[PDB]
Paper text:
By applying 17 rounds of molecular evolution to the GAF domain of PCB-binding NpR3784 CBCR, we have developed the first CBCR-based NIR FP, which efficiently binds endogenous BV and fluoresces in various mammalian cells.
To reveal the structural basis of the protein stability, brightness, and specificity to BV chromophore, we determined the crystal structure of miRFP670nano at 1.95 Å resolution. miRFP670nano adopts a GAF-domain fold, but with the N and C termini located in the spatial proximity. BV is covalently attached by a thioether bond between the conserved for CBCRs Cys86 residue and the C31 atom of the ring A, similar to the native CBCR’s PCB chromophore, but having a double bond between C31 = C32. This mode of the BV binding is different than in natural BphPs and red-shifted BphP-derived NIR FPs in which BV is attached via the C32 atom of the ring A to a conserved Cys in the PAS domain. In the chromophore-binding pocket, BV is stabilized by eight hydrogen bonds with D56, Y67, T84, R71, and H117, π–π stacking with Y87, and T-stacking with F59. Of the 18 amino acid substitutions introduced into parental NpR3784g, F25C, Y27F, H87Y, N99I, and N117H are located within 3.6 Å of the chromophore and either directly stabilize it or provide for it favorable accommodation. One of the important substitutions, N117H makes a strong H-bond with the ring D, which is absent in NpR3784g, thus preventing rotation of this ring and non-radiative energy dissipation via photoswitching. Another critical mutation is H87Y, which introduced a perfect parallel π–π stacking with BV. F25C makes additional space in the chromophore-binding pocket, possibly enhancing BV accommodation. T57R substitution introduced a flexible positively charged residue near the chromophore binding site, enabling electrostatic attraction of BV and its additional shielding from solvent.
Author numbering: 1 to 147
Protein backbone atom coordinates (compact mmCIF):
# COMPACT_ATOMS: atom_id res chain seq x y z
CA UNK A 1 0.00 0.00 0.00
CA UNK A 2 2.59 2.52 1.18
CA UNK A 3 -0.27 4.83 2.29
CA UNK A 4 1.52 8.02 3.19
CA UNK A 5 -1.41 9.74 4.88
CA UNK A 6 -1.93 6.82 7.25
CA UNK A 7 1.73 6.61 8.16
CA UNK A 8 1.84 10.35 8.79
CA UNK A 9 -1.23 10.23 10.96
CA UNK A 10 0.27 7.38 12.95
CA UNK A 11 3.48 9.26 13.32
CA UNK A 12 2.03 12.48 14.72
CA UNK A 13 -0.20 10.42 17.08
CA UNK A 14 2.78 8.46 18.24
CA UNK A 15 4.76 11.57 18.84
CA UNK A 16 1.98 13.42 20.66
CA UNK A 17 1.37 10.44 22.98
CA UNK A 18 5.06 9.83 23.72
CA UNK A 19 6.09 13.45 24.28
CA UNK A 20 2.74 14.23 26.07
CA UNK A 21 2.28 17.46 24.08
CA UNK A 22 -1.00 19.11 23.00
CA UNK A 23 -0.46 19.08 19.19
CA UNK A 24 1.83 17.48 16.67
CA UNK A 25 1.33 18.33 13.08
CA UNK A 26 2.95 18.18 9.64
CA UNK A 27 3.19 21.32 7.55
CA UNK A 28 3.75 20.58 3.86
CA UNK A 29 5.28 23.27 1.62
CA UNK A 30 3.93 24.23 -1.77
CA UNK A 31 6.33 25.11 -4.50
CA UNK A 32 6.57 28.80 -3.30
CA UNK A 33 7.07 27.88 0.39
CA UNK A 34 3.65 28.67 1.36
CA UNK A 35 2.01 25.49 2.66
CA UNK A 36 -0.77 23.61 4.36
CA UNK A 37 -1.11 21.87 7.78
CA UNK A 38 -1.69 18.51 6.19
CA UNK A 39 -1.90 16.14 9.16
CA UNK A 40 -2.58 16.89 12.79
CA UNK A 41 -3.09 15.13 16.18
CA UNK A 42 -4.42 17.60 18.72
CA UNK A 43 -6.02 17.40 22.14
CA UNK A 44 -9.89 18.04 21.82
CA UNK A 45 -9.59 20.86 24.22
CA UNK A 46 -8.08 23.18 21.52
CA UNK A 47 -9.03 24.19 18.00
CA UNK A 48 -7.84 21.98 15.10
CA UNK A 49 -5.64 23.72 12.50
CA UNK A 50 -5.88 20.85 10.07
CA UNK A 51 -5.80 21.97 6.39
CA UNK A 52 -5.01 25.61 7.19
CA UNK A 53 -3.13 27.18 4.35
CA UNK A 54 -0.27 29.42 5.65
CA UNK A 55 1.75 32.03 3.73
CA UNK A 56 4.73 32.51 5.98
CA UNK A 57 7.00 35.35 4.88
CA UNK A 58 10.19 33.94 6.41
CA UNK A 59 9.73 30.66 4.57
CA UNK A 60 8.56 32.31 1.34
CA UNK A 61 11.45 34.81 1.29
CA UNK A 62 14.24 32.46 2.36
CA UNK A 63 12.65 29.56 0.45
CA UNK A 64 13.44 27.40 3.47
CA UNK A 65 17.19 27.52 2.89
CA UNK A 66 18.21 27.63 6.57
CA UNK A 67 15.80 24.74 7.41
CA UNK A 68 17.16 22.84 4.46
CA UNK A 69 20.51 22.93 6.37
CA UNK A 70 19.17 21.77 9.65
CA UNK A 71 17.92 24.88 11.42
CA UNK A 72 15.03 24.31 13.79
CA UNK A 73 12.97 26.24 16.33
CA UNK A 74 12.75 25.22 19.97
CA UNK A 75 10.96 27.84 22.14
CA UNK A 76 9.67 27.08 25.64
CA UNK A 77 7.64 30.30 26.01
CA UNK A 78 6.60 32.24 22.94
CA UNK A 79 5.65 35.42 24.97
CA UNK A 80 9.18 35.90 26.34
CA UNK A 81 11.01 34.80 23.19
CA UNK A 82 12.11 37.46 20.80
CA UNK A 83 9.69 36.95 17.94
CA UNK A 84 8.52 39.43 15.37
CA UNK A 85 4.92 40.50 15.82
CA UNK A 86 3.19 38.89 12.86
CA UNK A 87 4.84 35.51 13.55
CA UNK A 88 3.83 35.66 17.24
CA UNK A 89 0.25 36.46 16.17
CA UNK A 90 0.22 33.35 13.86
CA UNK A 91 1.27 31.27 16.87
CA UNK A 92 -1.35 32.97 19.09
CA UNK A 93 -4.02 32.16 16.50
CA UNK A 94 -2.87 28.50 16.76
CA UNK A 95 -3.14 28.88 20.63
CA UNK A 96 0.56 28.11 21.03
CA UNK A 97 2.60 28.60 24.25
CA UNK A 98 5.71 26.57 23.20
CA UNK A 99 6.89 25.27 19.83
CA UNK A 100 9.34 22.66 18.59
CA UNK A 101 9.59 22.77 14.80
CA UNK A 102 11.99 20.66 12.69
CA UNK A 103 12.59 20.33 8.92
CA UNK A 104 11.41 17.30 6.89
CA UNK A 105 13.76 16.74 3.93
CA UNK A 106 13.72 15.04 0.49
CA UNK A 107 17.49 14.88 0.06
CA UNK A 108 18.52 18.49 0.71
CA UNK A 109 15.09 19.71 -0.49
CA UNK A 110 12.85 21.13 2.31
CA UNK A 111 9.53 19.31 2.00
CA UNK A 112 7.84 20.41 5.15
CA UNK A 113 7.99 20.82 8.93
CA UNK A 114 7.25 18.40 11.76
CA UNK A 115 5.93 20.54 14.63
CA UNK A 116 5.04 19.92 18.23
CA UNK A 117 3.08 22.64 20.11
CA UNK A 118 2.32 23.02 23.71
CA UNK A 119 -1.06 24.87 24.07
CA UNK A 120 -1.70 24.56 27.95
CA UNK A 121 1.40 26.28 29.23
CA UNK A 122 5.06 26.89 28.38
CA UNK A 123 7.25 23.85 28.04
CA UNK A 124 10.99 23.37 28.12
CA UNK A 125 12.17 21.23 25.24
CA UNK A 126 14.83 18.69 26.26
CA UNK A 127 17.86 17.73 24.11
CA UNK A 128 16.58 14.25 23.54
CA UNK A 129 13.13 15.56 22.39
CA UNK A 130 14.73 17.62 19.70
CA UNK A 131 16.67 14.49 18.60
CA UNK A 132 13.46 12.45 18.83
CA UNK A 133 11.53 14.84 16.56
CA UNK A 134 14.43 15.14 14.13
CA UNK A 135 14.67 11.36 13.89
CA UNK A 136 10.96 11.09 13.31
CA UNK A 137 11.42 13.59 10.47
CA UNK A 138 14.09 11.29 8.94
CA UNK A 139 11.60 8.42 8.96
CA UNK A 140 8.98 10.67 7.32
CA UNK A 141 11.52 11.70 4.65
CA UNK A 142 12.02 8.05 3.68
CA UNK A 143 8.34 7.44 3.55
CA UNK A 144 7.62 10.46 1.33
CA UNK A 145 9.85 9.35 -1.44
CA UNK A 146 8.39 5.87 -1.57
CA UNK A 147 4.75 6.77 -1.13
C1 LIG B 1 4.55 38.23 8.94
C2 LIG B 1 4.83 38.82 7.79
C3 LIG B 1 4.16 36.77 9.17
C4 LIG B 1 5.26 35.76 9.25
C5 LIG B 1 6.54 36.13 9.42
C6 LIG B 1 7.61 35.36 10.05
N1 LIG B 1 7.58 34.00 10.25
C7 LIG B 1 8.79 33.76 10.85
C8 LIG B 1 9.38 32.46 11.26
C9 LIG B 1 8.76 31.12 11.34
N2 LIG B 1 7.60 30.81 10.78
C10 LIG B 1 7.41 29.51 11.08
C11 LIG B 1 6.14 28.83 10.71
C12 LIG B 1 5.24 27.84 11.36
N3 LIG B 1 5.31 27.49 12.63
C13 LIG B 1 4.37 26.54 12.85
O1 LIG B 1 4.20 26.03 14.01
C14 LIG B 1 3.56 26.28 11.66
C15 LIG B 1 2.44 25.35 11.36
C16 LIG B 1 2.03 24.45 12.18
C17 LIG B 1 4.13 27.16 10.66
C18 LIG B 1 3.71 27.30 9.21
C19 LIG B 1 8.47 28.97 11.92
C20 LIG B 1 8.62 27.58 12.45
C21 LIG B 1 9.37 30.04 12.08
C22 LIG B 1 10.66 30.03 12.85
C23 LIG B 1 11.79 30.17 11.83
C24 LIG B 1 13.06 30.21 12.65
O2 LIG B 1 13.52 31.34 12.90
O3 LIG B 1 13.56 29.13 13.01
C25 LIG B 1 9.63 34.98 11.01
C26 LIG B 1 11.01 35.03 11.62
C27 LIG B 1 10.91 34.73 13.12
C28 LIG B 1 10.97 35.96 13.96
O4 LIG B 1 11.81 36.85 13.67
O5 LIG B 1 10.19 36.01 14.95
C29 LIG B 1 8.83 36.06 10.47
C30 LIG B 1 9.21 37.55 10.43
N4 LIG B 1 4.69 34.58 9.21
C31 LIG B 1 3.38 34.65 8.99
O6 LIG B 1 2.58 33.74 8.83
C32 LIG B 1 2.98 36.04 8.60
C33 LIG B 1 2.91 36.11 7.08
Amino acid sequence: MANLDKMLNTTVTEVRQFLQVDRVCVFQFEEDYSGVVVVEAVDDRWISILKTQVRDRYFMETRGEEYSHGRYQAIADIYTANLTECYRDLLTQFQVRAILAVPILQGKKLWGLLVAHQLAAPRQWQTWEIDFLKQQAVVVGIAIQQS
